[PDB]
Enzyme design. Sequence first.
Site, PDB file in Angstrom:
ATOM      1  N   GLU A  11       0.787  -1.163  -0.001  1.00 52.59           N
ATOM      2  CA  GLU A  11      -0.113  -0.010  -0.053  1.00 52.59           C
ATOM      3  C   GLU A  11       0.893   1.207   0.091  1.00 52.59           C
ATOM      4  O   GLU A  11       0.495   2.400  -0.536  1.00 52.59           O
ATOM      5  CB  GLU A  11      -1.042   0.139   1.326  1.00 52.59           C
ATOM      6  CG  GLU A  11      -2.090  -1.376   1.219  1.00 52.59           C
ATOM      7  CD  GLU A  11      -3.088  -0.901   0.260  1.00 52.59           C
ATOM      8  OE1 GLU A  11      -3.896  -1.757   0.087  1.00 52.59           O
ATOM      9  OE2 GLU A  11      -3.028  -0.101  -0.602  1.00 52.59           O
ATOM     10  N   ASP A  20      -6.630   6.267  -7.203  1.00 46.84           N
ATOM     11  CA  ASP A  20      -6.179   5.142  -7.734  1.00 46.84           C
ATOM     12  C   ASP A  20      -6.366   4.594  -9.371  1.00 46.84           C
ATOM     13  O   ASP A  20      -6.752   5.559 -10.021  1.00 46.84           O
ATOM     14  CB  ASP A  20      -6.440   3.810  -6.988  1.00 46.84           C
ATOM     15  CG  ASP A  20      -7.932   3.395  -7.075  1.00 46.84           C
ATOM     16  OD1 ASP A  20      -8.568   3.767  -7.921  1.00 46.84           O
ATOM     17  OD2 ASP A  20      -8.465   2.818  -5.888  1.00 46.84           O
ATOM     18  N   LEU A  32      -9.199   3.962   1.808  1.00 49.21           N
ATOM     19  CA  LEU A  32     -10.349   4.257   1.230  1.00 49.21           C
ATOM     20  C   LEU A  32     -10.941   5.457   1.662  1.00 49.21           C
ATOM     21  O   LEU A  32     -11.694   5.336   2.673  1.00 49.21           O
ATOM     22  CB  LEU A  32     -11.102   3.074   0.598  1.00 49.21           C
ATOM     23  CG  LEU A  32     -12.137   3.440  -0.368  1.00 49.21           C
ATOM     24  CD1 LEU A  32     -11.939   3.748  -1.746  1.00 49.21           C
ATOM     25  CD2 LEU A  32     -13.071   2.228  -0.372  1.00 49.21           C
ATOM     26  N   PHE A 104      -8.268  -6.429   2.053  1.00 45.60           N
ATOM     27  CA  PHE A 104      -7.749  -5.055   2.371  1.00 45.60           C
ATOM     28  C   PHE A 104      -7.819  -3.918   1.267  1.00 45.60           C
ATOM     29  O   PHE A 104      -8.363  -2.967   1.276  1.00 45.60           O
ATOM     30  CB  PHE A 104      -6.572  -4.991   3.229  1.00 45.60           C
ATOM     31  CG  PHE A 104      -5.960  -3.564   3.382  1.00 45.60           C
ATOM     32  CD1 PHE A 104      -5.439  -2.783   2.662  1.00 45.60           C
ATOM     33  CD2 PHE A 104      -6.118  -3.301   4.941  1.00 45.60           C
ATOM     34  CE1 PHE A 104      -5.089  -1.238   3.150  1.00 45.60           C
ATOM     35  CE2 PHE A 104      -5.638  -2.077   5.380  1.00 45.60           C
ATOM     36  CZ  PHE A 104      -5.245  -1.004   4.521  1.00 45.60           C
ATOM     37  N   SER A 117     -11.373 -19.528  -7.453  1.00 41.01           N
ATOM     38  CA  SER A 117     -10.185 -19.365  -6.889  1.00 41.01           C
ATOM     39  C   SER A 117     -10.326 -19.748  -5.295  1.00 41.01           C
ATOM     40  O   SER A 117      -9.543 -20.403  -4.767  1.00 41.01           O
ATOM     41  CB  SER A 117      -9.437 -17.974  -7.105  1.00 41.01           C
ATOM     42  OG  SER A 117      -9.041 -17.866  -8.400  1.00 41.01           O
ATOM     43  N   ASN A 132      -5.415 -19.058 -11.763  1.00 41.76           N
ATOM     44  CA  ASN A 132      -6.619 -18.333 -12.142  1.00 41.76           C
ATOM     45  C   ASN A 132      -6.678 -16.924 -11.608  1.00 41.76           C
ATOM     46  O   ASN A 132      -7.498 -16.222 -12.147  1.00 41.76           O
ATOM     47  CB  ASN A 132      -7.677 -19.482 -11.465  1.00 41.76           C
ATOM     48  CG  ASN A 132      -9.057 -19.097 -12.029  1.00 41.76           C
ATOM     49  OD1 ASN A 132     -10.072 -18.933 -11.142  1.00 41.76           O
ATOM     50  ND2 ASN A 132      -9.031 -18.881 -13.333  1.00 41.76           N
TER      51      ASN A 132
HETATM   52 CL   LIG Z   1       2.062   5.143  -2.761  1.00 47.59          CL
END
Ligand SMILES: [Cl-]
Length: 162
Positions: A11, A20, A32, A104, A117, A132
């Site tokens: 992150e 993003d 977020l 996350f 998956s 996959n």
């Molecule tokens: Cl960053």
Amino acid sequence: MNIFEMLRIDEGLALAAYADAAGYYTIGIGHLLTKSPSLNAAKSELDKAIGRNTNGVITKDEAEKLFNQDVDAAVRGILRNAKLKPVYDSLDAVRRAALINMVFQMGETGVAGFTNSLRMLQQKRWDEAAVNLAKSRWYNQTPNRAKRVITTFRTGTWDAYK
Ligand SMILES: [Cl-]
Ligand SMILES: [Cl-]
């Protein structure tokens, strides 16, 4: 290594908001601002989470607080989900970190979308899951991260992060 160091690598740290690849406003360590499409709703949301009337920039401490809050929310979101919980329960510690990492980044509902998956992970089909997960919008939009997280699910080791 643990989930907090793994996510800090994935992150990064930024003290001012940024958009993003899909245009979602983020700050700190992958925090977020909001799910809402409204930009005005984003700053309002942040201030409530920070607990102060921000001017846009936050401190390393506020970021780490948000990080602690968000890693905890990710884990609980996994356990509260009927599709994710059983998978999580079947995995070893390292692979559990990988699953949390995904939640996350994409949120509980988004990760619950990897039906095939997820089921392969629960059955311990490492390489099958690995191939996959590599065939997804997640991999296309964030390939370096997807690759590291996938390498983690494949090997069960922290090699992609050290
Ligand atoms: Cl960053
Ligand atoms: Cl990436």
